[PDB]
């Protein structure tokens, strides 16, 4: 049962030198599991999901096609930051569709796409408020990728509880937030994600559908990796779904271990729910 699954996860965590938050919520059925859920975990890129929700809601409500294009200045494409968009368009100064920018920001975790979209939607506060008004408490959106890059502690201002995340994922998956077509688009984009293949997906059967968004910090001079995260919705063999969010925070472990913590926890949940 759920209590025994929870105990297994807690036992697994006993020798990991990290603070690990876990939440799970069934979509169709009533399953719920939380571990270490009352802490505030740094989100890193996982908040590009929240951002995409706010952007697609604005495009919906204002009747703006996702095929309309922003002018992306070269200055919008900062160097020495993770950015597949910048490598694809190294001169910048070009027109890119909201669709193209959202796909890169979500599926490929583009840091420059993220900030382009924050500027479009009206800033971090707009997104913070948007999420809060969906009725999901315990999420804080305060800093852009550029801002996070300026100073180590700024990432902690973009925080969440793990149960907030899965509450939000469930509202999403049930298409309670967006238009049908914007929902379909963001869901496809989340399944198309290419980052974190050894996180939630890592130990699940080949071809399992995992609609997800990763997040990753750097490491400080004390050996601490603030955030190694993955959040998403997984399709079970009988077509039902569960939302899961894992935050491996403030870790002294190497990256292979941090990813494996996510993969193993997810595999434990999968095995329980398929049984």
Residue nearest Cl ion, Cβ-based: 177
Report the C-alpha gap between 71 and 267 in whole angstroms: 43
Q: Which does 45 bind (CB under 5 to 8 A by kind): Cl ion, Na ion, a copy of itself, none?
A: a copy of itself
Query: Which segment (5-13, 130-138, 168-176, 224-232) binds Cl ion by CB under 5 A?
Result: 168-176
Q: Is 188 in the site for Cl ion (CB under 5 A)?
A: no
Q: Which residues pair with 243 in a beta bridge?
A: 25, 233
Beta carbon nearer to a copy of itself, 57 or 230: 230
Shortest CA distance to 224 belongs to which of 152, 151, 154, 140? 152
Shortest CA distance to 84 belongs to which of 111, 66, 45, 102? 111
Q: Is 124 in the site for a copy of itself (CB under 8 A)?
A: no
Q: Is 10 in the site for Na ion (CB under 5 A)?
A: no
Stated as kind and residue range, the H or E segment containing 61 is helix 47-61
How many angstroms separate the Cα of 41 from the Cα of each of 82, 138, 163, 187, 268?
21, 10, 11, 24, 22
For CA atoms 3, 8, 9, 11, give the dihedral sign. positive
What DSSP designation does 192 have?
S
Q: Smallest distance from the beta carbon of 63 to Na ion, in angstroms?
A: 21
Q: Smallest distance from the beta carbon of 270 to a copy of itself, in angstroms?
A: 20
Q: Is 146 in the site for Na ion (CB under 5 A)?
A: yes
Q: Tell me, by CB under 5 A, how many residues bind Cl ion.
A: 5
Q: Is 60 in the site for Na ion (CB under 5 A)?
A: no
Q: Which of 25, 43, 52, 77 binds Na ion (CB under 5 A)?
A: 25
Q: Is 177 in the site for Cl ion (CB under 5 A)?
A: yes
Q: Which of 37, 57, 76, 259 binds Na ion (CB under 5 A)?
A: 37
182 in catalytic set: no
Site string for a copy of itself, 82-111 (x = CB under 8 A): xxx--x--xx----------------xx-x
255 in catalytic set: no
How many angstroms separate the Cα of 216 from the Cα of each of 78, 97, 110, 205?
18, 26, 12, 24
Query: Which segment (115-123, 169-177, 202-210, 255-263) binds Cl ion by CB under 5 A?
Result: 169-177
141 SS3 class: coil
Report the relative pairing of strands 241-251 and 19-26 from DSSP bridges: antiparallel
Single out the catalytic residue among 83, 100, 109, 145: 145
């Amino acid at each position: 049962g759920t209590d025994s699954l929870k105990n297994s996860i807690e036992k697994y965590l006993k020798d990991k030198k990290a603070k690990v938050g876990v939440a799970v919520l069934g979509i169709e059925d009533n399953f719920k599991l939380n571990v270490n859920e009352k802490h505030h975990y740094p989100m890193q890129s996982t908040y590009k999901f929240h951002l995409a929700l706010a952007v697609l809601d604005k495009l919906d409500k204002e009747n703006i096609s996702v095929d309309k294009k922003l002018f992306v200045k070269k200055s919008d494409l900062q160097p020495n930051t993770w950015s597949p968009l910048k490598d694809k368009y190294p001169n910048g100064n070009l027109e890119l569709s909201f669709s193209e920018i959202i796909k890169s920001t979500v599926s490929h975790s583009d840091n420059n796409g993220c900030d382009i979209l924050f500027r479009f939607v009206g800033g971090t506060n707009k997104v913070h408020n948007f999420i809060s008004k969906l009725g999901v408490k315990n999420i804080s959106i305060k800093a852009t990728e550029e801002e996070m890059h300026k100073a180590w502690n700024v990432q902690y201002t973009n925080w969440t509880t793990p149960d907030a995340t899965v509450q939000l994922l469930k509202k999403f998956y049930k298409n309670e937030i967006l238009s049908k077509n914007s929902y379909d688009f963001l869901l496809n984009t989340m399944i198309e994600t290419t980052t974190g293949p050894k996180r939630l997906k890592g130990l699940l059967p080949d071809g399992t559908v995992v609609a997800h968004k990763t997040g990753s910090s750097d490491t400080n001079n004390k050996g601490i990796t603030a955030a190694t995260n993955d959040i998403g919705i997984i399709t079970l063999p009988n077509g039902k779904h569960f939302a899961i969010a894992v935050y491996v925070s403030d870790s002294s472990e190497k990256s292979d271990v941090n990813e494996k913590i996510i993969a193993e926890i997810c595999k434990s949940v999968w095995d329980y729910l398929v049984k």
